[PDB]
């Protein structure tokens, strides 16, 4: 109930002042919040990628947190902000075009409003700057105590727009599952194939990647990078308990190429 | 009470020098909650960290020390000056017009030179003015220092300013310049202002002059979504000046325009 | 009592893995003021790591924890150790030589092995030690857990150092070389200490540099000569440096860490 932490994440970026100036905005409402980046280097309108560094969000930070997340090319449009309660006691905030989905799978909506009151805007709102005016000025306000029924009209859980997102699946004599993000600091691949799929199977393994061009390795299954010699690939599972692919002490992606969808096949 | 520090830079994030800033300001001022505006203002480009700041004062509270330093004259007869502004923030930086901007924002109130060793981080290192004066002087502010104390007070003429072009009527529309670019999405933003385009009561012709002229018809929108993805609009920004972007997508890499480039919107 | 936490690590802070460490920080040590270092460590670097980390002691106050990891070494027996220094910060991290420059600064009075179940964020998953034990372990002691309690006692010289090249005095000169690049501005910063070149003052020097001759002005600061004109100066950490004044040194004269720098009187 009390929400003195605020996680903040955009598409903005941090190279000049805009991100600060919601901080400024945020620190001016609730001038006792802690204010921390998730990060503002999303990919610009990449709602999705926004949605994917937000997944683990709600885990990693405790019950007293608003996730304030903004990437909003509908901006000044009917695409309104939401104000979520989650079932870990944290508050959402963000624009209603499926960037809060990932978060919401790994704690579902429990109560949930469309921001449209003005008295939890920053007056005058700009049309091309919701994220500012709407999006930081709420969550500054949830902050500082207004309740979370004030900020507008409830709305039914499934009014909140929702990111598909694709399974991994048992086929003839493997597991096919997909890219669904790079590890981008070090070229890891990670995929949507969870630990309790490939048990049957654990070793060393036949993966093939569908992607420019269709490679087949042959990988040992390791706990964690150090089990091969530097520079030789790994599959293990990730620190989000699905299967990934790396070089020990290199960049997976740099020697093998891959994007975001590509096909992943595990095969014993 | 100034217990909030916002703090602009151009030495970067990518090494420790702006957190071993944040430490001798911790050190002083255990209790500040320290943000950054941004610290990837271009190595010693007074103007564009100017710029950066010129909003700072509108978004941050009453409460807040700006401390700013892009000091190519570090370890020179360039002094330090921090000054109380109309809002009643108080701002830290070299007198070398870097706080120009914002002050035109909000104009100085009072103003001294930062000369008292008691407000420095001795000994003060040559290269480095904006750890040990500037970082160490916002510090001994937002703990309680009197403003009075750092210095001599200077009368506000001679602090350094930094010109600026205006906008104006010419034969059949309004010339103005871009002033910068919303580097993260490609958007152009001019020194237009709304008062002057007072005739949206009807396309608009915008003319670009570089070493080639750009010519395009472009609707008068209020935000991005207002025309098709990939397509060009001029939308008033956050700021309510005259701008130019592509519905998500990146202006300035399909028509590139650089800052002090001329540009004139008139009826078509 | 250390309610400042100081974070430094090679994650980058272009998506959420920094700030994942800072939510379990914040979970267990509510009231922390947590600032980042640098998250922009190059990948598996643990020297640069240890570089970036050199001055942090000096400049944060005694009631900092400084956090960092730079742990290829994540889910194998390479612990992560907890270390009180002489200024009485806390330094916790990967007992991979990370930590090495910071303790040169301020050295070791206690260290433990961070090896007790209670000071990490379970269960901790073998490809991040750095989430799990180091920055968990960190916070733990921001929340008042004496360090005695993450684990056992070890003696200082079981912490791994990593090598630190020292200049010396040669035939006619000093000879040193590059330890670091001022990336933002491309200023090349050496191993050669003030006390080396104040013997040498009459103020122009003749340096040499590995793989160039330069008779470079000895300046207190870059706006000393014309913009784009080259100087030797002392860093803000008092050693030898080069740099072009409102310009870019090492784009003119491309150099490495590791190379030689000779420095030699007129
Ligand atoms: N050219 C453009 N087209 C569409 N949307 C744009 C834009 N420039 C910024 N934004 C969008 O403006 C939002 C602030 Cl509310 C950001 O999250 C960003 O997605
Ligand atoms: N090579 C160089 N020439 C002139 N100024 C320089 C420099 N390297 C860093 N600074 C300047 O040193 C300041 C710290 Cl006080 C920074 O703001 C930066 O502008
Ligand atoms: N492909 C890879 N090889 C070796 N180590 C790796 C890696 N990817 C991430 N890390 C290492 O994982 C640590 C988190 Cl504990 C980071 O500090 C990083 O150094």
Redesign the pocket.
């Given at each position: 109930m009390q929400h003195n932490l605020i996680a903040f994440l955009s598409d903005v970026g941090s190279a000049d002042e805009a991100h600060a100036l919601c901080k400024g905005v945020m620190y001016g409402v609730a001038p006792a919040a802690t204010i921390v980046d998730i990060t503002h280097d999303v990919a610009p309108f990449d709602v999705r990628e926004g949605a994917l560094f937000l997944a683990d969000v709600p885990h990693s930070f405790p019950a007293h947190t608003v996730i304030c997340a903004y990437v909003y090319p509908e901006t000044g449009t009917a695409t309104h902000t939401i104000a979520v309660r989650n079932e870990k006691g944290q508050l959402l905030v963000g624009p209603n075009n499926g960037l809060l989905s990932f978060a919401l799978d790994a704690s579902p909506a429990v109560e949930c409003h469309e921001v449209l009151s003005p008295d939890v805007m920053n007056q005058p709102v700009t049309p091309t700057w919701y994220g500012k005016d709407i999006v930081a000025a709420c969550a500054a306000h949830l902050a500082a105590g207004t309740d979370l029924a004030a900020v507008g009209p409830r709305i039914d859980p499934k009014q909140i727009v929702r990111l598909p997102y694709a399974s991994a699946s048992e086929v003839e004599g493997g597991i096919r599952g997909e890219v669904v993000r790079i590890?981008r600091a070090?070229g890891?691949v990670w995929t949507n194939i969870p630990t309790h799929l490939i048990g049957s199977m654990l070793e060393r393994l036949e993966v093939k990647i569908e992607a420019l061009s269709d490679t087949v390795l042959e990988l040992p299954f390791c706990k964690t990078?150090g089990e091969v010699d530097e520079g030789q690939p790994l599959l293990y599972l990730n620190s989000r308990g699905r299967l990934a692919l790396?070089?020990?002490?290199?960049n997976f992606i740099e020697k093998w190429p891959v994007v975001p969808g590509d096909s992943i096949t595990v095969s014993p």
């Open positions: 590890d070090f890891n990078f790396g070089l020990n002490q290199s």
